[PDB]
């Protein structure tokens, strides 16, 4: 009997006031929340934000919507949500968000005989995540999603994670290109602004950057170039062309790396550790070339001094580079 | 009793004329404003603007909305804001603004027994900010947000900062990786257009650009290449091919750095500080190459003069470059 269902639904909305929360003027209304992470689209270090798509479900109880005689859970059309009171939940750290609307608006309203309302949305949100890039690419980030009621204080509404630690699902199936989600965490608290205290839910992810290929891509070529620059100290002065070739090649390669690879790296004007390491290697190869130039200059008049300088350089340069690497790793690992 | 509140709200909204401002035809309505800054997402010199996210709150009084018998401040659903008079506040220098609308429109309406209305929005605005890049990247910018009433003159509405200089908060939340907030200022005034006088509020920030990234990426490579160009003097002047190759390599590397350092900057006609430094380094390497060319031209008949010219260049060029750097860093700092 669909006529009886229509009559009951019309009676439920008869005299309903969307401007008044459930139990207005009384105890706070408790709202439980679930999030199903469909995907995490991209994580940006330039824009300091990440994009995340989710099924966001809210659960609450409204006694004005309690119905009897229908032994079913009424899944209604989404437009019915326009005639009902819904919580003013929003995300504090979002920069842009939308609810999908193809083919219809991605929204679900489900009523229960006792007056319980389940309200589901499908939301793609870009959320800001400030990142400490000082240790890039050896860094580890912590990106949060914040959930709060915009207008109602703790005297009116309350939030909690429905299901405890199982409120948020689908994290383990998320694959990120340059990050691996080590852990996720759920927090509930209260936040005080000048207008009062509001409930707050937090969903945080700890991201560890995949270092397997970063070492082999941006560090190994520089270290090999520095070693090749060292190699020039073991060549006799009669083979000056080889020394000139090695020195010029290493210096030009380091200039090209500094100018281009860092451009390929995120273009945010930040001082990372990789930049310091590349600059150190560049300075070392430049010093090696200058040492060769000095040896060549003083070669004719004082061959013995040139030989002594080369022999001492063979020891000094690797030792100084080892000390520089030790300090760099101590200060960044 | 929720029915009493519902009937009181209906009585308040019965006969309410949204087309007429409070005290229409009489004294002006005083509107106080508060801003709680969430973040400044980005500051762009190419587009000459900055993105700002804020909680914008307005406080005014409407005697038509005064209610009695309910000793509470009614926090109403934001949709009722569509049925009340609100000030026509706009931002003169904005280019693209919106009110966040997930899950609902981030809007707050609060009524008081005395008739006072508190109206809050969460707004992201891309406000224009013309910048002077003559000292880039050692510059200091000043970006403002202008708040005005469009249709109502000073005989109809008044603007003031509620709370004095404590009307804007969240300044410490601003974290720009390239800038640093130095000072923020609040101004109130009147602006006269052909249609009359209007109230005006102004929130201004002074930003100072960081220099470490530019030191590591632009100045140091140029200095190193300039120092490399001086090795040509210490080479014997008979090795014509080697010295020519070294000079040409330095010139080409300088030009490649200059062409690759276009960066995210507008095509301004004036000369920036970085442009001056790059031109100076190019002038130095060009002068070194020209000095070698003169030496090669003249040494075939007067070897003593050529040797003297090389010996004097070895001292003149570093000293002149040191003087140039001293002048540059004393003028621009």
């Amino acid at each position, epitope marked *: 009997n669909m006529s009886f269902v229509k009559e009951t639904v019309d009676k439920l909305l008869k005299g309903y006031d969307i401007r008044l929360r459930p139990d207005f003027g009384g105890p706070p209304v408790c709202v439980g929340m679930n999030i199903d992470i469909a995907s995490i689209d991209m994580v940006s270090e330039v824009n300091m934000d990440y994009t995340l798509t989710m099924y966001f479900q809210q659960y609450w109880r409204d006694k004005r919507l309690a119905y009897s005689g229908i032994p079913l859970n009424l899944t209604l059309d989404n437009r019915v949500a326009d005639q009902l009171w819904v919580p003013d939940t929003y995300f*504090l*750290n979002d920069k842009k968000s939308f609810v999908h609307g193809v083919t219809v608006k991605n929204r679900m309203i489900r009523l229960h005989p006792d007056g319980t309302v389940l309200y589901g949305l499908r939301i793609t949100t870009t959320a800001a995540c*400030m990142m*400490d890039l000082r240790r890039y690419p050896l860094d580890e980030q*912590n990106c*949060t999603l*914040e959930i709060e009621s915009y207008g109602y204080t703790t005297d009116d509404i309350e939030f909690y994670w429905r299901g405890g630690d199982k409120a948020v699902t689908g994290v383990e199936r998320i694959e990120l290109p340059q990050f691996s989600i080590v852990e996720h965490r759920l927090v509930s608290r*209260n*936040v*005080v*602004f*000048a207008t009062g*205290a*509001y409930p*707050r839910l937090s969903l945080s992810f700890r991201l560890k950057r995949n270092i397997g290929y970063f070492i082999l891509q941006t560090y190994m070529p520089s270290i090999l170039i520095t070693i090749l620059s060292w190699v020039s100290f073991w060549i006799n002065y009669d083979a000056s062309a080889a020394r000139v070739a090695l020195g010029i090649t290493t210096v030009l390669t380091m200039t090209t790396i500094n100018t281009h690879l860092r451009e390929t790296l995120p273009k945010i004007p930040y001082v990372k550790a990789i930049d310091m390491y590349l600059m150190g290697c560049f300075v070392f190869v430049f010093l090696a070339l200058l040492e060769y130039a000095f040896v060549n200059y003083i070669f004719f008049s004082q061959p013995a001094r040139a030989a002594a300088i080369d022999r001492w350089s063979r020891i000094v340069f690797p030792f100084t580079f080892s000390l520089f690497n030790l300090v760099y790793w101590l200060y960044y690992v | 009793n929720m029915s009493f509140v519902k009937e009181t709200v209906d009585k308040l909204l019965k006969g309410y004329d949204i087309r007429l401002r409070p005290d229409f035809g009489g004294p002006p309505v005083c509107v106080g404003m508060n801003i709680d800054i969430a973040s400044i997402d980005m500051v762009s010199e190419v587009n000459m603007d900055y993105t700002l996210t804020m909680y914008f709150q307005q406080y005014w009084r409407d005697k038509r909305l005064a209610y009695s018998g309910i000793p509470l401040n009614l926090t109403l659903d934001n949709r009722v804001a569509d049925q009340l008079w609100v000030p026509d506040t706009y931002f003169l220098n904005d280019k693209k603004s919106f009110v966040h609308g997930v899950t609902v429109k981030n809007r707050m309406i609060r009524l008081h027994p005395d008739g006072t209305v508190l109206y809050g929005l969460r707004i992201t605005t891309t406000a224009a900010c013309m910048m002077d890049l003559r000292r880039y990247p050692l510059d200091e910018q000043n970006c403002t947000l202008e708040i005005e009433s469009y249709g109502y003159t000073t005989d109809d509405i008044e603007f003031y900062w509620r709370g004095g200089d404590k009307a804007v*908060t969240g*300044v*410490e*939340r*601003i*974290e720009l990786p390239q800038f*640093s*907030i130095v000072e923020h200022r609040l101004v109130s005034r009147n602006v006269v257009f052909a249609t009359g006088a209007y109230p005006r509020l102004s929130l201004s920030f002074r930003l100072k650009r960081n220099i470490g990234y530019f030191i590591l990426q632009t100045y140091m490579p140029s200095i190193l290449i300039t120092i490399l160009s001086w090795v040509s003097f210490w080479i014997n002047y008979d090795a014509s091919a080697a010295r020519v190759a070294l000079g040409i390599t330095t010139v080409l590397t300088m030009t490649t750095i200059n062409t690759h350092l276009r960066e995210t900057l507008p095509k301004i006609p004036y000369v920036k500080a970085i442009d001056m430094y790059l031109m100076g380094c190019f002038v130095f390497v060009f002068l070194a190459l020209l000095e070698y060319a003169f030496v090669n031209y003249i040494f075939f008949s007067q070897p003593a003069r050529a040797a003297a010219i090389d010996r004097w260049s070895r001292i003149v060029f570093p000293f002149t470059f040191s003087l140039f750097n001293l002048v540059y860093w004393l003028y621009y700092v």
Partner: nanobody
Amino acid sequence: LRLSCAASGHTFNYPIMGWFRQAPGKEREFVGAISWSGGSTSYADSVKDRFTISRDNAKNTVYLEMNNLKPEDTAVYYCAAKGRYSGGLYYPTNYDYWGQGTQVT
């Protein structure tokens, strides 16, 4: 008198450090707040123009320099850390990590 509060650990997740003082017969009261990165400072009117706040990232220490002490400035002090999205600045409930009580008379 000069108070120094040294912080160690995940200081990037808590970029704001604040100072509070508790009267012997009252509740805690805000004193000042310092941002770690920008060095921006915020002060309360009751102790303004008398106290200065700075920070140094070499050791991650925030310094509160106190000048022109008065008998009204007798309270037990606390140094606290605030999260990035923790909300208001003048309210002790929004601060997660605290320090140890310091007596000044």
